[PDB]
Amino acid sequence: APSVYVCGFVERPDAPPKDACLHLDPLTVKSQLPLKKPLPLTVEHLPDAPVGSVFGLYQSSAGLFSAASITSGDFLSLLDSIYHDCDIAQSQRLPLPREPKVEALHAWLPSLSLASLHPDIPQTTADGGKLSFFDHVSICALGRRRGTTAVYGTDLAWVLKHFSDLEPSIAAQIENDANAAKRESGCPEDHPLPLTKLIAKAIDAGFLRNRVETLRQDRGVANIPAESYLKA
Amino acid sequence: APSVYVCGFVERPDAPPKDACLHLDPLTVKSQLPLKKPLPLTVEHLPDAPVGSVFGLYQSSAGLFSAASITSGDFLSLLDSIYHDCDIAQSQRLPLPREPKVEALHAWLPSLSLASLHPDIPQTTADGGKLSFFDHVSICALGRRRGTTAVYGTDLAWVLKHFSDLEPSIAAQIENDANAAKRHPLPLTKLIAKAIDAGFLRNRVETLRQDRGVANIPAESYLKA
Amino acid sequence: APSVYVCGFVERPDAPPKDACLHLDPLTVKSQLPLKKPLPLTVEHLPDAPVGSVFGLYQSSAGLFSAASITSGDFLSLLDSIYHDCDIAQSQRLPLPREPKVEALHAWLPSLSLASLHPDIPQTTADGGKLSFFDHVSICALGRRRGTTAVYGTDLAWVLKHFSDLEPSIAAQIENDANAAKRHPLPLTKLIAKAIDAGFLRNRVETLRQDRGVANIPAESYLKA
Amino acid sequence: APSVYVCGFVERPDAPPKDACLHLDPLTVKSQLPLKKPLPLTVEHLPDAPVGSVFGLYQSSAGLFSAASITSGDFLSLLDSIYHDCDIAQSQRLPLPREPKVEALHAWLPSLSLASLHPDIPQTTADGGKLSFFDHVSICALGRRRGTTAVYGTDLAWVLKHFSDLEPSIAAQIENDANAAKRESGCPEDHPLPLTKLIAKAIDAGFLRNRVETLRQDRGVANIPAESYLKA
C-alpha cells in the first residue's frame, strides 16, 4: 500500500495565459478556502480514471498550489508495467536513481490541470466574486496554464523542496494535511482504468506542437530544480 | 466485419535519409523479390501486436511501395472505441466524411516502418548485394524514413489513388493480390507506453506534413497532419 | 568416409571483447535454448561453403560452447589434397602423430565464429532480452571473439577432453547428440580470396596462441599456434 | 589478350639477408649474363603454376632487377574473379583508380623470388665463380630476400618509374626486351591452375609473423613511391 504524491502550481500569475477563461477569480478561490473535502484526482479529466485525491490547495506570492496523492493500487501497478515498456520513461534527462512509477508519471502525465464547474445559467457573485466550484484536479500531458508542471515523490518533504518559491508557511502546514487525509479508508477496484480512453488521451498528446519546449519553460516558471525527475 | 488497407511508401529515393543504416540496397530489393508468404503486419514493431499482413511490396520510379491489410477484429473494434474518446481523431484538418476506425489510424499510427533482419557481422555481401531479411512492416507514430506517411482505407481502388507518382501498372495488379490473399489480445499497456514515447518527438506533426507532401498524397485525404 | 568434429568456445566471459556489438546477451542465449533443427556449418561465413552442421550449443561457467560435425566428402578430400602441399600443415609445433585432414583444418580454418541475424532497428528487446537469431557458425582464420581457438578431431571423447574448464555433464550428453544427429562444389576461388585476406591480419599466430591458452586446451594438441 | 608486367629487384645488396645461402655469386650472375632464353614465371614456386615469363634480369648499383610478364589467360581471369571476393584486394592503402587483376596480384603475391638450381654434386667454378643455373622467378607472398617487393602494371614505362634507383640505362633497354619477347607464340591451357596447391600456399601465408611490416620495409628498400598500388 505505497502511494505517490502529486504537487505543483495549478495556476501562477507570472505565467498567465492569453485566454481569460483560464483566469480564476481569486475571489471564488478564497471562497472555496481550505480543506472542505478533498478533490478527485483524475487522469486526463476522465471521471472514470480516478487515481488519487487532492488534499488541499494553497496560495502563494507565486500562485495557487495543489497537493494530492495517488492511492489507486491498480493504477500504481500500471505505471509499473508501463515503465519498462516505455523508453521515454526509462531514459533520464539527468542521471538519478531508478524510480519506476514516478518516472512513468513524468513521461505520461507531466502537468496538472485544475477544472472548475459553474452553476452557470443561474450566475452568482458571492458578495464580491463570481461563483465556481472546484470539482477535480487532473494529471495531464500538458496543463492549459503555464508553470503547471508537477513533481512526483514518496515524501512531500522532498517533493516540496523543488518549489523554492513556496512560502515555508504553506509547505509547513501542507505536510500536515497529508497525514490528516491519511485517515481516508480504502476504495480499490473503483473503475479498472479506461485503457482505451487513456490510449486515446495519449494519442491526442502526439499532436502537440512544441510540447517538450513548453514543459521546459514550465519547470523554469515553477522554479523547480534542473536536477529533477521531470523529462523536460 | 471488414478489413482496412494500409498503403504508402516505406522508402522514397526522392526523400533521402541523413544516415547510412536507413539506406536500402537495390540488391536486397531484387533479392526478396515479389512474395514468398504473407508478411506480418505489426504495431510499433511489437511481435505480439499483429493486426494484419503485408501482401506485397513493389518498386517505383519514386520508391518502394507497401500494400497490407488489417483483419484483426479486436483491433478493428479498438479504433472504434478509441475514436469517440480521441479529440484529435474526431476533429478533421479539412472537411471530409466522418470515418471512425480510419481517422483513429491516422492520429494513432499514421506512418509505415519496414524492418529487416541483418547479420551480426558482414555475412553475405552476396556480391550481388548486402544481406538482409524482410521480417515485417509496422504501423507507427512517425517512421524514421521520409515520405513514409501511409494511407488507410476500405477499398484499394480509392486507397491507392492518393498516390500520384505511383504507376497504374502496379496499382492495377496490386488490387488483385488483395483478392488473391483473401483466401494476442493487444497489450494495451505496451501500446500506451508506445503512445507515450510518441509524445516525446520534436516536430512530429510538422514532419508528417512534409511527408504527405513528399509522398504525393492530396490535401483532401484523411491525414491528421 | 568418416566425419570430423569441431569443438570449442565461440564466446568466453573470461576472455572479453573490446567493443559492444561483440557482446552476447544471456537473454538471447536462454532464448535460442537447446536445439531447434541442426545449424549450418559454413566456411568463412560463405553460405555456399556448407561443410557440416552444428548439433548443439551449451553454456558453461566459462562461456558458450559449440559442437559441430563436418560431413562433406568433397571438403574432407580437400584437407587431404591441401595437406601434402601445405608446409604449415605438415610441420607440427610439437611432436604428435601425423593427422592430414585435421592438421590442415588447424592451419587453414582454426577458429570458430558465431553469426546472428539482428533487426534493422531495435525490434524486440523482448524485455526478457535483445533480439537475435542464430543462423550459423563458421570455421575461419581467426575469430573476432577470443578463446575461439577451436579443436578438430575424429571422436568427440578425445576432441572434448582438450577443454579443462568444460563441465563433464555437458560433454557426457553432447557425445549423444552426435549419435542422435547421425540419423555447392566449393568456390575454391572464393576460398583462396578468403585465405588471402587472412594473409593480412596483425598478430594472427600470436593471437591464436593466447586463444588456446585462454580456452584451456593443452600444448599437446594439434593447434598450429 | 591483355597482359600484366612484373618488375622489381630479386636481390639487393643494401638489403642482404643473414643467410649466406641466399647470397648469389655475382660471378655466376654475370655468367648467365643477358637474354639467353626467358625464365619461367611461376606462382609460389609451383612448376604447375606457370603464369608468365621473365624476359630479362639486370644489374644496378642497387641490385639485380627482374622484368617479366604474365600471359596466362586463365590465370589473368582468376585475379579477376578473386578480386571481388577479397576485401584485402579491394581496399586500398592510398586512393587510386580501381585496377582489378593488379590489385589482386599485390594482395595475393606481393614479392618476387629468384630460384636457381645447382648441378650440385659435381661442383663448378666458371674460371672464377661457382656454378648455378637460373631456372625460374616466382611471385610469392614474401620473397626470402629483402626489398624484393614487386610492381604490377599494363606498361613498363609506368611500372619502371617506381624504382628511382634504377639506372635509366637499364630501364631504357629493358623496355625493348619486352617488345622483343612479344614475339612469343601462344600456350593457353598449360595447367589449369592448382587451385588446391594455391590455397595451400595461401594458407602458409597466414602464419607469417610480421609480414605486413616486412612488406613495408621492402617498398622502402626498393625505394618505390609511397603512392603505389602495393598493399604494404
Curated annotation (Swiss-Prot), chains A, D:
UniProt-annotated catalytic positions: 45, 113, 136
Domain of life: Viruses
Catalysed reactions, as listed in the record: Cleaves -Ala-|-Ser- and -Ala-|-Ala- bonds in the scaffold protein
Locations listed in the record: Host nucleus
Function: Protease that plays an essential role in virion assembly within the nucleus. Catalyzes the cleavage of the assembly protein after formation of the spherical procapsid. By that cleavage, the capsid matures and gains its icosahedral shape. The cleavage sites seem to include -Ala-Ser-, -Ala-Ala-, as well as Ala-Thr bonds. Assemblin and cleavages products are evicted from the capsid before or during DNA packaging.
Subunit (UniProt): Exists in a monomer-dimer equilibrium with the dimer being the active species.
Protein name from the UniProt record: Assemblin
Annotated organism of origin: Epstein-Barr virus (strain B95-8) (HHV-4)
Parent sequence residues shown: 4 to 235 of 605
